[PDB]
Structure formats: structure tokens, C-alpha cells
Ligand binder design. Structure first.
Ligand SMILES: C[S@@+](CC[C@H](N)C(=O)[O-])CC1O[C@@H](n2cnc3c(N)ncnc32)[C@H](O)[C@@H]1O
Length: 215
């Protein structure tokens, strides 16, 4: 693990030099929870490479720069109430929890991954992350409204439930476009002056499958 962490520190330094990681909060989160903690043993040797990696059930853990970009856009602060849609390995949720210092809610539709993520989080000593099995395109009403909702799967359009569950002034970060390609990373802010949207570039996440996602 010592060798793996050395490589990871270089990755974080690189992201900072690239201007990808720009806040100390995101840098600290990345250093506390290296990506190798979230992937199967056979992929740990590649955890420091800035590329997405496979996880069970045909899904993947995002590339380090993509996770960093989304966290920086989120502008997370202690005490915020965050909902992540698409737990996967639980890596992103762990990072979020380190920054907000409170309960984080994350939803995953595949039972196998709910278990996978729970094991990774427990193994890493994370307690504030709460993994729920369900259709995240419907959000998670029990703990709404949220300061930020971070969706890590691509949707064909912006799910209305996610907008409804945002606090006034809150934001939704979500990929919108085609099934598994040609998606645009959107930053959607819910304000009194209306819904404001900023496009952040092309991406290619796994599809958001659900009632308000893909069929
Ligand atoms: C490829 S992963 C992204 C990364 C993940 N955030 C991590 O830290 O590993 C995201 C996923 O969202 C799931 N996802 C898709 N549709 C979903 C839905 N309707 N509700 C919840 N999760 C969904 C997939 O099964 C998959 O694991």
C-alpha cells in the first residue's frame, strides 16, 4: 500500500499542476481516500493512472480528473446535505463525506454494487456515507432538499425530481446526452431567478437507468 500511495500522491500533485484540483478541500479528500481503496485487487496497480477503471456489474469508477472536476464544481462546504446518484464503488461518496463532515446519501440501482460499495466504505472506516438501493433518477425524498445533487450516470434530459429536491440556491451536476456517449456535463442551479445552466464539456458516463432516466 505504501508503494501505491506514493504513486497516488504523484497523481494528486499532477491534477493540481493541471489546474484540475484547485481547492485544498478536494486535495485533502483525494489524499485521505486514494482510489486504490475502491477497486478490485487486480486493478489497484492502475488506480493512480488518470483513466476510468472497471468495477463489478459492467459499471466503472470514474477517472480521477473527472471526479475532481465534479467536486470542484460542487463547491462543497462542511454541513451541506449531499445526494449522489450512482454509488458505484463508493469512492466519490467517500470523498464527498470527507469534505462535508456529515451524512452523505448515495443511491445505486444494482444490488451487487450496493454491497460492493458498502464493503469498500466499511473497510476504509467511512461511517457517514449511507448507501441506498434504488432508482436515483427519482432522487431520495426522505432526506431532501439537498445543497448539491451529483449524478454520475448519463441522463437523456434533466430529471424533474432532482430539480424539485434541490434547496433554493442548490445545484445539480449531471451528464445529459446520449445513452453511453455524446453527453454534456451540466451544472444546473436552482435560483429564484429561475433554473440556470452552465455546460462544462463532453463526457461519456454509463447510462442513468430508471423512471426518469433511460429504459
Ligand atoms: C459508473 S458508476 C460512477 C461512479 C461512482 N460514483 C463511484 O464513485 O464509483 C455509476 C452508476 O450509477 C448506477 N446508476 C445508473 N442508473 C442509476 C439509477 N437509476 N439509480 C442509481 N444509480 C444508477 C450504475 O449502476 C453505476 O454503478
Amino acid at each position: 500500500e505504501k508503494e501505491l500511495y506514493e504513486k497516488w500522491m504523484r497523481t494528486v500533485e499532477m491534477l493540481k499542476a493541471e489546474g484540475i484540483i484547485r481547492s485544498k478541500e478536494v486535495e485533502r479528500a483525494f489524499l485521505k481516500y486514494p482510489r486504490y481503496l475502491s477497486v478490485e485487487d487486480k486493478y489497484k496497480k492502475y488506480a493512480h493512472i488518470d483513466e476510468p477503471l472497471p468495477i463489478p456489474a459492467g459499471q466503472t469508477v470514474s477517472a480521477p480528473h473527472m471526479v475532481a472536476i465534479m467536486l470542484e464544481i460542487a463547491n462543497l462546504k462542511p454541513g451541506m446535505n449531499i445526494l449522489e446518484v450512482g454509488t458505484g464503488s463508493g469512492w466519490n461518496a467517500a470523498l464527498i463525506s470527507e469534505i462535508v463532515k456529515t451524512d452523505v446519501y448515495t443511491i445505486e440501482r444494482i444490488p451487487e454494487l450496493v454491497e460492493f460499495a458498502k464493503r469498500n466504505l466499511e473497510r476504509a472506516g467511512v461511517k457517514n456515507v449511507h448507501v441506498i438501493l434504488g432508482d436515483g433518477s427519482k432522487g431520495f425524498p426522505p432526506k431532501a432538499p439537498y445543497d448539491v445533487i451529483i449524478v454520475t450516470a448519463g441522463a437523456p434530459k434533466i430529471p424533474e425530481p432532482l430539480i424539485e429536491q434541490l434547496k433554493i440556491g442548490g445545484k445539480l451536476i449531471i451528464p445529459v446526452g446520449s445513452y453511453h456517449l455524446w453527453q454534456e456535463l451540466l451544472e444546473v442551479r436552482k435560483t429564484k431567478d429561475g433554473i440556470k445552466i452552465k455546460n462544462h464539456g463532453g463526457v461519456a458516463f454509463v447510462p442513468l437507468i430508471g423512471e426518469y432516466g433511460w429504459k
